[PDB]
Write a protein that binds this ligand. Structure first.
Ligand SMILES: O=C1CC(I)=CC=N1
Length: 280
């Protein structure tokens, strides 16, 4: 590469290959995301201004040789790998709580600046060595439009709603919270309908009482099976009532009833939050 030394594939990202790369001029290590191929360039370039401690810094947008690359700061590890490495012991609760608190601060920041993620998942959550966690790839899905992960997708998206809101990110984060606590994905679907029925079997099939308008959504079918709703108490033991209360509010069916990031930060679950050092 003209402008990088020591370029190494990390893996396949949402939009193309992701590399660890060394900037030739400065010697810094960055995450270089190739976008597999006018409006998207200016919109993503605005994200270079969207800066916060819990947001992965977008350093540059490189548009050269009719190719597009996003340059992000490089962080030590992603949460999917950390979760896998932590599976035998579990992530300690104080660290789960710290990470959730920080992720909510990142969401609250982006949402206050009218930027959504729309595709949060553990792979886009990055950790450093001292206890910070950051979200990557905010804003890309609006700008741009191996198998896709559906496990974190909000039910309105699965039911074919064409209108995103902040609530989609709260749903995904709730699913990630549950997975940290139980060491198992909450809703590991392998197709849209398996994902949908996995949510319905746990939370009950939604209806007009809990979710006004649900029956008029594009992909809703009156023939869906009607499951009764289970209790978070069987789903995420041994999480305490404060954690279950918060999670329950993050996973309301109606996006309009889902707790906001800002309100979640005030929840009693976080009264005793701290910032521990992770065991890498
Ligand atoms: O900065 C990063 C990105 C990814 I994907 C993995 C680890 N560090």
């Amino acid at each position: 590469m003209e402008n990088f030394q020591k370029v190494e594939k990390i893996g396949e990202g949402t939009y193309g290959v992701v590399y660890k790369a060394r900037n030739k001029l400065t010697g810094e290590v960055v995450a270089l995301k190739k976008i597999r191929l006018s409006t998207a360039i200016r919109e993503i370039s605005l994200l270079k201004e969207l800066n916060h401690p819990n947001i992965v810094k977008l350093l540059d947008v490189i548009h050269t040789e009719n190719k597009l690359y996003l340059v992000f700061e490089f962080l030590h590890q992603d949460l999917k790998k950390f979760m896998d490495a932590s599976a035998l012991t579990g992530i300690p609760l104080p660290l789960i709580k710290s990470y959730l608190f920080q992720l909510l601060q990142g969401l609250a920041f982006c949402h206050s600046h009218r930027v959504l993620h729309r595709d949060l998942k553990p792979q886009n959550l990055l950790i450093n060595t001292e206890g910070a966690i950051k979200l990557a790839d905010f804003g890309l899905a609006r700008a741009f439009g191996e198998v896709v992960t559906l496990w974190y997708r909000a039910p309105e998206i699965l039911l074919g709603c064409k209108y995103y809101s902040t609530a989609v990110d709260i749903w995904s984060l709730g699913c990630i919270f549950a997975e940290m606590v139980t060491r198992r994905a909450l809703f590991p679907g392998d197709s849209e309908i398996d994902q949908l029925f996995r949510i319905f079997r746990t939370l009950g099939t939604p209806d007009e009482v809990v979710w006004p308008g649900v029956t008029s959504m594009p992909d809703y079918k009156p023939s869906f099976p009607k499951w009764a709703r289970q209790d978070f108490s069987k789903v995420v033991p041994p999480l305490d009532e404060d954690g279950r209360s918060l999670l329950s509010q993050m996973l309301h069916y109606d996006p309009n009833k889902r707790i906001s990031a800002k309100a979640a930060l005030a929840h009693p679950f976080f009264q005793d939050v701290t910032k521990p050092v992770p065991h890498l």
